[PDB]
Amino acid sequence: VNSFSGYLKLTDNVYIKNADIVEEAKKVKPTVVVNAANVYLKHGGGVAGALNKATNNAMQVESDDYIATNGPLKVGGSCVLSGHNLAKHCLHVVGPNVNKGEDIQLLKSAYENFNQHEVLLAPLLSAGIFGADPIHSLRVCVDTVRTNVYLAVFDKNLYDKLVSSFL
Ligand SMILES: C[C@@]1(C(=O)O)CCN(C(=O)Cc2c[nH]c3nccc(Cl)c23)C1
């Protein structure tokens, strides 16, 4: 038993809710919140900009030190950093950005990072400003992630469509 509430169950291990991931994180304090990161951990907009804003820019400060030490992530890769006031940990995961021409097949590799964590609160990778089809992203999530994932979908209209079209 865990503290996530109001989710619809899609599969044995995947759940989905119309929710702002920032507010969901603030209420649940999950062990892991996933950020829709880029390779530079520049949290300017989309989910990353919102999460970072909610940490009063502490996520960005920590991220800049991470990059200065380690260099950029790989597309499809991830790193574990602090969750600040939102979660114990933040798993920064880089899905491919279609608006940069990145290979959508890397989306499966991106979701594989979730399997290193037993339970996660997450957005749909490569959705929103990353330019992928959220329905495809949901399919890859379901077919790749084996751990328990709670997907927060900010837009009520997209949420309804994702549910209604789910196979
Ligand atoms: C539309 C979403 C939802 O409704 O759940 C799915 C994808 N998403 C993002 O925020 C993805 C994202 C990461 N960096 C960004 N920078 C600027 C704008 C966006 Cl969209 C993003 C929210």
- What number does the ligand 1 atom closest to the CA of 47 have? 10
Distance 43 CA to ligand 1 centre (A): 11
The pick from 129, 141, 163 for probing ligand 1's pocket by mutation, whose C-beta has the most ligand atoms within 8 angstroms, reads: 129
The DSSP 8-state label assigned to residue 128 in this structure reads G
User: What is the Cα Rg of the chain in Å?
Assistant: 14
> Could you tell me which residues are beta bridge partners of residue 34?
91
Resolution in A: 1.0
Apex 85 CA angle, 84 and 88, nearest 5:
60
Experimental method: X-ray
Q: How far, in Å, from the CA of 86 to the mean position of ligand 1?
A: 18
**Cα distance between the two ends of the chain:** 26
Here the tokens at position 44 are 């300017």
Count of CB atoms within 10 A of residue 58's CB?
13
HSE, side-chain direction, 13 A CA sphere, residue 147: 13
Nearest to 91 by CA among 153, 7, 149: 149
Domain architecture of the chain: domains with CATH? 8-165 (3.40.220.10)
- Cα of 99 vs centre of ligand 1, distance in Å, is 13
Residue at 45: amino acid letter: G
What is the Å distance from ligand 1's center to 47 Cα?
5
DSSP 39: T
What is the 8-class DSSP label of residue 114? G
